Amino acid sequence: ADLGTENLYFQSMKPSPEEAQLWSEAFDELLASKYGLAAFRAFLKSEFCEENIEFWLACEDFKKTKSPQKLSSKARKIYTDFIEKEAPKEINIDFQTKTLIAQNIQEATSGCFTTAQKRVYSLMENNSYPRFLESEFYQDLCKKPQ
């Protein structure tokens, strides 16, 4: 086979078959793995619905925020990207969840996006994740060579 620089680079970003197989155990496990996260995002991007997972990741970064100053500004950015009318990464939430967020941006807390996040989480967990696991792409990641 090839031990060329290009190919090695690409192999270095593939998970082992072993670790990919473990992503079937639980959604949280897929997400806690850097490779599993990248795999899931690529599956979703191929189906033009990567915004849910990008949304979810930004809410995780947001939850970990300990400053009220940057917590208000992160909330405005998340809003701009994922929540407002015609946002590039617009998610599907109800007009009344959006309202509450928009109402809360000024005095944002760690749970500004919990309602929206949980909807999006459960969306992915019960929907895109099972489809991920059945994909030809994920199967090949799990296949041991030879």
- Using alpha carbons, select from 54, 28, 27 the residue that is nearest to residue 133: 27
The three-state secondary structure class of 58 is helix
CB distance 91 to 83 below 8 Å = yes
CA distance 12 to 40: 17
Task: Provide the greatest CA pair distance for the chain.
Answer: 59
Counting every residue written for the chain, the total comes to 146
* DSSP, res 33: S
CB distance 91 to 55 below 8 Å = yes
Domains 16-47+128-146 and 48-127 share a fold: no
Which alpha helices (DSSP H) does the chain contain, by range?
5-12, 17-21, 27-32, 34-46, 51-63, 68-78, 95-104, 114-123, 129-134, 136-142
Q: Using alpha carbons, list the distances in angstroms from residue 7 to 13, 26, 34, 82.
A: 10, 31, 20, 36
The hierarchical CATH code for the domain 16-47+128-146 is: 1.10.196.10
- Using alpha carbons, select from 14, 124, 133 the residue that is nearest to residue 59: 124
Angle, nearest 10°, between helix axes 34-46 and 51-63?
140
Q: CATH fold of 48-127, please? A: Regulator of G-protein Signalling 4; domain 2 (1.10.167)
> What are the residue ranges spanned by the domains of the chain?
16-47+128-146, 48-127
Residue with tokens 């670790």: 19
| Chain breaks of the chain after residues with C–N above 2.5 Å | none
129 CB-contact burial (10 Å; exposed 0-12 / middle 13-18 / buried 19+):
buried
Resolution value, angstrom units = 2.3
CA distance 111 to 68: 13
76 CB-near residues (< 8 Å, 6+ apart): 105
**Residue 46 region by backbone torsions, left for phi larger than 0, else alpha for psi between -120 and 50, else beta:** alpha
Amino acid at 22: L
7 CB-near residues (< 8 Å, 6+ apart): 1
40 CB-near residues (< 8 Å, 6+ apart): 30, 31, 53, 128, 129, 132
